[PDB]
Amino acid sequence: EYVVEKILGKRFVNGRPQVLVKWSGFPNENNTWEPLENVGNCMKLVSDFESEVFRL
């Protein structure tokens, strides 16, 4: 697939978590919501996002 650059958001769909992905080397109009379990190991990126939420 393509490469996750940054996590920009989180939501639940039917109770399951999804993240809004900014793809490396793609513009923002290419951002997509992906199941958390299908995002691969970018746990550092997920951690960054969650920290930013918790911050405010």
Q: Give the contacts of 28 (CB within 8 A, at least 6 positions apart).
A: 22
Among 11, 53, 56, residue whose Cα is nearest residue 32: 11
**Structure tokens, 8:** 């920009």
Give 44's Cβ-side CA count (13 Å radius). Answer: 2
* Domain assignments of the chain as residue spans, ordered by start: 1-56
Experimental method: X-ray
CATH architecture of 1-56: Beta Barrel (2.40)
Among 43, 30, 40, residue whose Cα is nearest residue 1: 40
31 — phi, psi (to 5°)?
A: -55, 140
45-48 long-range Cβ contacts below 8 angstroms, 24+ apart? 45/4, 45/5, 45/6, 45/7, 46/7, 46/19, 48/6, 48/7
